[PDB]
Amino acid sequence: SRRVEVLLTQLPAYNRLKTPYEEELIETAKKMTAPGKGLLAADESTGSCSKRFAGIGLSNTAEHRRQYRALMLECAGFEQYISGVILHDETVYQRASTGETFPQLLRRRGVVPGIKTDCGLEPLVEGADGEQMTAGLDGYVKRAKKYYAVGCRFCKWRNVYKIQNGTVSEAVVRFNAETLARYAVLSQLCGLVPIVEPEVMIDGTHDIETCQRVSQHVWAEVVSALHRHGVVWEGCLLKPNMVVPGAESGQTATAEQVAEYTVKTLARVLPPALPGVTFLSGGLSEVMASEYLNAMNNSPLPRPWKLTFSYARALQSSAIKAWGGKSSGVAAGRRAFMHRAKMNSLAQLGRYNRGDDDK
Amino acid sequence: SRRVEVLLTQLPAYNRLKTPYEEELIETAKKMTAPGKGLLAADESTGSCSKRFAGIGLSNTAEHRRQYRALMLECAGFEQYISGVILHDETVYQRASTGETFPQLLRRRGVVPGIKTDCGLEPLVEGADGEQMTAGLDGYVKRAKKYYAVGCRFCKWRNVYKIQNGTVSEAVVRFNAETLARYAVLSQLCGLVPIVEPEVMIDGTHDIETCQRVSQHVWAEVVSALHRHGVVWEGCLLKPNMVVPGAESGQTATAEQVAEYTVKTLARVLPPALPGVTFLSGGLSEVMASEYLNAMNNSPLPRPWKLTFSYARALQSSAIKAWGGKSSGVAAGRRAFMHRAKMNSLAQLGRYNRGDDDKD
Amino acid sequence: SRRVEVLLTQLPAYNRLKTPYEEELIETAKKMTAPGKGLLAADESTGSCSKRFAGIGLSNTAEHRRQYRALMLECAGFEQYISGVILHDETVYQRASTGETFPQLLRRRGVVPGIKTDCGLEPLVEGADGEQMTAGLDGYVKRAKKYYAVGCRFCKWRNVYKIQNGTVSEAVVRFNAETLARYAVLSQLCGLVPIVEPEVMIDGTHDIETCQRVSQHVWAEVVSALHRHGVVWEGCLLKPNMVVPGAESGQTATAEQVAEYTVKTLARVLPPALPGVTFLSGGLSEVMASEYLNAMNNSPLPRPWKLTFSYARALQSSAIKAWGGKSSGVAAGRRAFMHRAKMNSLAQLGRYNRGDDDKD
Amino acid sequence: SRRVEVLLTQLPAYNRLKTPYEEELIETAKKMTAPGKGLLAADESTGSCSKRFAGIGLSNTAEHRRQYRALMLECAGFEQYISGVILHDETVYQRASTGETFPQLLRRRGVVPGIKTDCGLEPLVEGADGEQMTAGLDGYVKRAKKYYAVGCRFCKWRNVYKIQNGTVSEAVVRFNAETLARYAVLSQLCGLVPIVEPEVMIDGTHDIETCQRVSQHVWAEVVSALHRHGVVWEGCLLKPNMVVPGAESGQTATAEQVAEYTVKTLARVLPPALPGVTFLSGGLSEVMASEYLNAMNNSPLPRPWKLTFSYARALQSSAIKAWGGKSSGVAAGRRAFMHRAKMNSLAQLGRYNRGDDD
Amino acid sequence: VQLQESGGGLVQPGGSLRLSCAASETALTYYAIGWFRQAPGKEREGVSCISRINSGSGARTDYADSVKGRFTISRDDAKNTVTLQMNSLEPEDTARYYCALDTTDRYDSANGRYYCTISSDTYDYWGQGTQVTVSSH
Amino acid sequence: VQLQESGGGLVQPGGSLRLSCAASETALTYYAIGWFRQAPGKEREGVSCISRINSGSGARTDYADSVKGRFTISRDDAKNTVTLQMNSLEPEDTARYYCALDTTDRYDSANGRYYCTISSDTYDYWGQGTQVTVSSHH
Amino acid sequence: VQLQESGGGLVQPGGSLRLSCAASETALTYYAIGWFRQAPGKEREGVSCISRINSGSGARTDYADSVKGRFTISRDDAKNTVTLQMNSLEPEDTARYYCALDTTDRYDSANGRYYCTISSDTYDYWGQGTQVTVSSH
Amino acid sequence: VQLQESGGGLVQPGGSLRLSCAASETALTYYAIGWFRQAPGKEREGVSCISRINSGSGARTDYADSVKGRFTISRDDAKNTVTLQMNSLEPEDTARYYCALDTTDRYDSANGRYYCTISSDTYDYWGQGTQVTVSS
Secondary structure, rough: OOOOEEEEOOOHOOOOHHHHHHHHHHHHHHHHHHHHHHEEEEOOHHHHHHHHOOOOOOOOOOHHHHHHHHHOOOOOHHHOOOOEEEEOOOHHHOOOOOOOOOHHHHOOOOOOOEEEOOOOOOEEOOOOOOEEEEEEOOOHHHHHHHHOOOOOOEEEEEEOOOOOOEOHHHHHHHHHHHHHHHHHHHHHHHHHHHHHHEOOOOOOOOHHHHHHHHHHHHHHHHHHHHHHHHOOHOEEOOOOOOOOOOOOOOOOOOHHHHHHHHHHHHHHHHOOOOOOEEEEEOOOOOOHHHHHHHHHHOOOOOOEEEEEEOOHHHHHHHHHHHHHHOOOOOOOOHHHHHHHHHHHHHHHHHHOOHHHHHO | OOOEEEHHHHHHHOOOOOOOHHHHHHHHHHHHOOOOEEEEEEEOOHHHHHHHHHHOOOOOHHHHHHHHHHHHEEEEHEEEEEEEEEEEEHOOOOEEEOOOOOHHHHHHHOOEEEEEEEOOOEEEOOOOOOOOEEOOOOHHHHHHHHHHHOOOEEEEEEEOOOEEEOOHHHHHHHHHHHHHHHHHHHHHHHOEEEEEEEEEOOOOOOOHHHHHHHHHHHHHHHHHHHHHOOOOOOEEOOOOOOOOOOOOOOOOOOOOHHHHHHHHHHHHHHHOOOOEEOOOOOOOOOHHHHHHHHHHHHOOOOOEEEEEEOOOOOHHHHHHHHOOOOOHHHHHHHHHHHHHHHHHHHHHHOOHHHOOOOOO | OOOEOOOOOHHHOOOOOOOOOOOOOHHHHHHHOOOOOOOEEEEHHHHHHHHHHHHOOOOHHHHHHHHHHHHHEEEEEEHOOEEEEOOHHHHHOOOOOOOEEEEHHHHOOOEEEEEEEOOOOOOOOOOOOEEEOOOOOOOOHHHHHHHHOOOOOOOEEEEOOOEEEEEEOHHHHHHHHHHHHHHHHHHHHOOOOEEEEEOOOOOOOOOHHHHHHHHHHHHHHHHHHHHOOOOOOOOOOEEOOOOOOOOOOOOOHHHHHHHHHHHHHHHHOOOOOEEEEEEEOOOOOOHHHHHHHHHHHOOOOOOEEEEEEEEHHHHHHHHHHHHHOOHHHHHHHHHHHHHHHHHHHHHOOOOOOOOOOOOO | OOEEEEEHHHHHHHHOOOOOOEEEEEEEHHHHOOOOOOOEOOOOOHHHHHHHHHOOEEEEHHHHHHHHHHHHHHHHHHHHOEEEEEOHHHHHHOOOOOEEHHHHHHHHHHOEEEEEEOOOOOEEOOOOOOOOHHHHHHHOOHHHHHHHOOOOOOEEEEEEEEEEEEEEHHHEEEEEEHHHHHHHHHHHHHOOOEEEEEEOOOOOOHHHHHHHHHHHHHHHHHEEEEEEHHOOOOHHHHHHOOOOOOOOOOOOHHHHHHHHHHHHHHHOOOOOOEEEEEEOOOOOOOOHHHHHHEEEEEEOOOOOOEEEEEEOOHHHHHHHHHHHHOOHHHHHHHHHHHHHHHHHHHHHHHHHHHOOOO | OEEEEOEEEEEEOOOOOOEEEEOOOHHHHHHHEEEEEEEEOOEEEEEEEEEOOEEEOOOEEEEEEHOOOOOOEEEEOOOOOOEEOOOOOOHOOOOEEEEEEEOOEEEOOOEEEEEOOOOOOOOEEEOOOOOEEOOOO | OOOEEOOOEEEEOOEEEEEEOOOOOHHHHHOOEEEEEEEEOEEEEEEEOOOOOOOEEEEEEEEOOOOOOOOEEEEOOOOOEEEEOOOOHHHHHEEEEEEEOOEEOOEOOOOOOOOOOOOOOOOOOOOOOOEEEEOOOO | OOOOEEEOOOOOOOOOOOEEEEOOOOOOOEEEEEEEEEEEOOOOOEEEEEEEOOOOOOOEEEHHHHHOOOEEEEEEOOOOEEEEEEEEOHHHHOOOEEEEEEOOOOOOOOEEEEEEOOOOOEEEEEOOOEEEEEEEO | OEEEEEOOOOOOHHHOEEEEEOOOOOHHHHHHHHHHHHEOOOEEEEEEOOOOOOOEOOOOOOEEEHOOOOOEEEEEEEEEEEEEOOOOOOOOOOOEEEEEEOEEOOOOOOOOOOOOOOOOOOEEOOOOOOEEEEEO
């Protein structure tokens, strides 16, 4: 019948985000998930850079951080294997030796520049002790629009979940999902493809079965919140943990088991309209991050989204050590970096060969 | 900091259903979604048979209803195209010309027997006028375990959503989703693969964009409830409507448009671990149901689940009319049935050819 | 900026139930919570009656159950203390020695007749082992309209929650709340004032703090579900457990402690528009149910709703024992019943005197 | 059946906030809702002060804003009627002519000092056009602990809901409720009594029945969100709109109708453990805000919480006009302010008399 | 719980007394009330009952044959008392007189009326009684 | 849909032929297959049927009496064909020979086996036929 | 709102009076209170003020020079009154005497004390007064 | 990873050869490529570099002075090869010739073009070489 004339946007079925960047977001997500390519995660904080420079005894100055990023970004040829680079805010405004800003350099070489837009972990207050939320939604629209103006086309936001006593609190599952979903739609409104990172951390004594069950519970709520907030699924990406046994569990898992636990979990919760999954390496070794990603791209289970990488330490660890922070080590660093990029490129294609890798 | 030892099943992340039939459910769902095959929906109520027999002047007796199902179930060769048959409760216990019960006949020929387990539509009371819930969860476990005992291995439950004024009430979105999910987990506990049917009905003046948005909103809530109730995703099937313009909207859509609106909606909500989608024909003609299903299997959009059919009228309309309720029409009826079955089998594979089909 | 004209009932803020009995439900709820009066819960199942008849050696026939209810319903004078009687379905149609049916008898004496409309506890399947749902929503509207037609004006539906290992599963919290809310709204549509009974059971080793925290969690979800389904708050009643230590906990609590834990829990979740709270006696002794209710009606905490009783064992235990199932014991049985009725009537007013009660 | 030992705080039924200020929060909320007293809302923004000073021709400087608050805060005797004062961030650190900071002055006179801690309205992005969220949760814990350190003991956070076409979007109902609940639990962690203000705005052509239905829907979701986040109900306050016809509806309602629509809505959603309701005046005149509150405290409907005021314009409008920004008008301004305070004090007790008023 | 009888005493034959029945914590309007008497060495016999008040025809009464015409029973629900006016007392009327409540719901649905009985099977809450002695000596 | 018959021709009496029955897009393994023949000016008569393959005991066969001992019917489900080996042909065997599918589910649950019938009532999808002429004087 | 003064009258020189200041619906404990006077043909001059009670130390007072030593002001917050004891009255003390409240928060935080002023600038709610005439005649 | 050089051999003075540089698992289009040579008992000298292809002005080239005018370097990104055409060879041109990849992003943002260097400081992935002997 008929009683009141309302806006379509006031009705629950019409909650989808209206953004003028929709077609551009979809194209960026396709570019970012190109076959045989993945993301380089170079978005470490200045503090986190002190832990990377510790082993090589390099002072944590803004210039040494620039040379650290320059070791990889001004390396020729990595566009064969890297589709996008997650930049830290500081690096977005720094310049390469070519005279361009790093966003300009990356777009000249067909690489999508992205920016980490979250403002770090804080205590959750609700839930259990040790659980953390992520700050940064205040003033987000102004920040994201400014990153877009200087050339960025995607962003990354990280929430963490601490498995304790085989479980996580329902407070952190509800709250962090709502944070990720709100972040996603604000990014798409400003023209950045949001990378939604709900990381079930590896720390703890839990086995791979506890991780599987917590990960599915956590990611399912993330997906539910994304529906509620009206995300554009085709212009969105997920950066999840791999389902692996806890770091201090004493248990071990083969690459095929990790692949089966991970892909079957994703297949239960992740809508196939989502273009790509860019796994974080977390607490895996360089070889293990290539080994596991390869196993997932040989899985018989359903996997309609692209399974690729968004690696930080798993792409730079050997490179930083060979670099030594010295200009004489640049050649060795880029040799190490490019080898890791090539291995993970093959792992995305399912043709990674462990014998062609480190021993 | 106080601690307590609890059961894992008391923790929210451990809500997955524990059923001893899990491996059998997964195998049945694979069998039902075999390439080039779909389901025959023969689960009409005694009332619904009254409208099927109206045109041919056949009396609505239990025996003529038996011959109605026998016209198709004792037709040779349909195992080429039909992976499973949704049976009515009455037909489960009726006997074929071979001497077997119809579930026994279907299991001899490699076809999975299924049963409609819902108890019909009722007024929702909440929400808007004209919206309906589905009854039947009281005593469900007792019924399902008995259907399993006589050979059934999957079931079907139908909820409807009536688009009025471009929307549906939030009461019907929440309640019907909660009903379907509860039905799904009770079925899997009893060893039946649940066919979850959330049908956004064709009636009304809404356009295809209204159907897309209501369908996505409705199906997303169904999926969310399935998560809450702990369904075994790999042993479950979805029977949705296709996204099409309203029956009295005055708008029309091509097969390529219907496929894009439907697949893009499913891809936004439906987990890939779900083995198959068995579309209902609803208010489409026989040729149109094959044409739309074929277009779906030629879509460039993501579709990790099997896209197949669970057709009733779209498989039997010509068969009933050529049959005429007379034994002399059996040969023509089975010729019509088998043609519709082969056409939809090719449509599932993406190889349906409209020129090899009817012209009217 | 596109617009559509919709029904108000399709908008989430307009989900309140439209029932033609709204004015009568509100008046009935006021009558049921009249000062100094409470409810007699005489709705035990045929199974439960064998456990009541065990000690007195009375055979569990429909006629002996009739005499059991007649011992109290044909007792003169209980209208001073009893505002309503929860009847079992069997008793609604049985006849008193006055020649009228028991609903007619209660209606002649100004007592509101009510009916238990749930169909008993079943395994929840979801959640943890030992948790239970309540059946009976299929065909509910038909049943309730018949109870109203024969004189019933309120109803009762019981869900239970089993504290295990200091907690309950989230599945039972959502599902049982959703069941109670749907039951409540269907009752008000048919003209019965719903008594919503979410009983956190006394069984187990948990302390009064575990009961407090589980009860608040459970009752908050019941209230949320009632909002979602659109209950008429002013024509609704709650029948909760009191917050007490577990039966096998080894801990004890005073009446004033039980009063503080119970009222402070209710004050956190229960809207003041709800007219009344009719406590269940559960696993308390006869005297404990009277003193605890008395302590709550002397509480300094906020309690805008009427706090009264809906007792079964706490009103009949001594009555059955003095009766013995023999016609010679009727006088002694009615003396025990009427004493308990007067004690709880005074407890409702807060003027219960422990020295006027039984010895220990 | 496998078993695991977990923390109680990991179980959903144990989600209540653990704060060391719990006993103090409850005591503050009792103090703020003392019989016959209400709150003075003096938390206008620098922008909002430009609209107040427009009529009197006073320049909008930090010093004239200080004198604006001083006209009321250094007026003797208002502690008879005012239990607490909501301060703006600027005023928290400004000093009175007595030499104290305004929080110190208020604590010397037994008045609870409070602070508006939200960071203003922003576009909701989701939902319908014109709907707004409230910013300010980033760094909230650091701000609240600093406000507590300088003497504040409660805070205020305002969310708004715009009735358009007889309804509001479900996005704004869910999102704004979640913001208020998160704000409330963070405040109690830092020792501030949260005043939860979910204002269903008066703008629009909607009738009082539309306002009733949207208000109940909005407030019920706020209450549900407060449950989810584990608020301490006994140390919390609500600052809702009154249920009234739309400003441009052409409809009118009597004080007795407004009281019935408002109390019956609150009674359907608001737990009685919540100590007090401090109504916002919004678009009501000075006399109408006193008349409506009086009707609210003479209602037969259930109202277990204290029904009082948290008025801004309804307490200062006549005072500012008589003040004129000139030192010669201070005596006349304070006479008007104290009269409004006495009227609303009587309205809280239910003894407001319209004939003793303007 | 117990009722309180009063009004008895010692009278000469042909005289009269007025017995009164009072209740503290019970509303008598909900009961049929009966007067009984017991002489030393005899069983307890019913003297008079009065039903609850029927809104159209008032309350019903009944009497033992030995007292008809001489005794009159009445009830005042407002004052919460039941009275037995005993006239023309013979010495065969000497006994202890008791008040009691009928604990059975005495309704007759065939005739739509409350009634009472002179029996005592369903009576309870007997008082302590009051002695009535009719004698010439 | 239609079957394809082949193998017919002209032979002298006492000779032999082999008729073949083929199907394009249908799997014959699901049907009982029958060979029929019609002589000019006569009705269509059943010659031989073959049931579906019974696991372990093979397919069941039947023949018209006038043909027993001379014709042999077989089926190859892998090659999707049915064969009729006709031996010792008489001049009374001249006719057009047809292939057809039994559209009835020919199962005998009492004996637990698939069967066949030479009756043409439930046969369908007849082909165009193949001519078999047995004559010496041609 | 306005205060109620009392206690004035006619006395001979050297005599004494006690003026009282009362309030109906106002708590004087929240104000500094001042006594003022107006003489025939002259303007209103301050006579005595008293501050609010300073916790543990009592109230601070001040007086006009012409009355120092003879007048004493006190306050009773419980009885809600302000008293002015006028002793040894001279003829220049004849006037109408008024009570008033200081509407300014008279606190001095450097000095940690409530204070008062006899200046009438910030006083309000003047009563009707009470006449005091000191004369022989 | 390593490049594969070919085309060298024995020629008489004034003759010519054509050296080819091929890549297995690397896309040469992303690098500036340089040809180098080493004679027995001396250091490795740069012969010719070629930048990446600049749309649409082609790649920039550079040559050692001792070789300018006689050698020509080219690249075919489709066939993934770099060619060095050596003409009119003198006997002082005898050496083993290597191709290598410049691992530095050789971009000139002031002129908006890719460039190259014969320096060899930033070159890597040297092949095994190909011997070129010019002698009578």
